[PDB]
Design a protein around this ligand. Structure first.
Ligand code: NA
Lengths: 96, 97
């Protein structure tokens, strides 16, 4: 797929909240509090294995502050189902 | 202060991956790695001087680096004036972009 840098407006902040809420169901870090998503935010547009530029879905790479610690979260979104999944959540990591 | 962009993966970028692996070989966390190549996407931050109007103080790069058949994430700083570089972080294996 292609990658681009995207804004950290409300839509991006809500991806961060999604990531923290999903990580809180897992419980690996205990109960995290969402603060904010920071730059840079990277979005991948994913195409079907067949055709040219048939959009399957999206992936996001976020830097998210939760409980005052910086994490990396990877999120997938399927175009047809509108379903979001937390793929990975790791850290704490140093600031970019 | 600064701006992020996606950059090409030409010889400037590949030499950043080489630098990253040579620096990581000095640290030794992964033993002795053999640099393969940098893959897209490569991210570059241009950092501005704290002295008026937009003047470049340096760069930060975040790269995906294949070394010894394994993918790592590397963070590199480059000072604008001296062209000196610092490996800030080298971690993996990481999932493919
Ligand atoms: Na957004």
């Amino acid at each position: 797929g292609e990658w681009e840098i995207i804004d950290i407006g409300p839509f991006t902040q809500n991806l961060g909240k999604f990531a923290v809420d999903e990580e809180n169901k897992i419980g690996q870090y205990g109960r995290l509090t969402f603060n904010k998503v920071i730059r840079p935010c990277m979005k991948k547009t994913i195409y079907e294995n067949e055709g040219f530029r048939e959009i399957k879905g999206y992936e996001y790479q976020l830097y998210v502050y939760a409980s005052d610690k910086l994490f990396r979260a990877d999120i997938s979104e399927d175009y047809k189902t509108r379903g979001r999944k937390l793929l990975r959540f790791n850290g704490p990591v140093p600031p970019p």
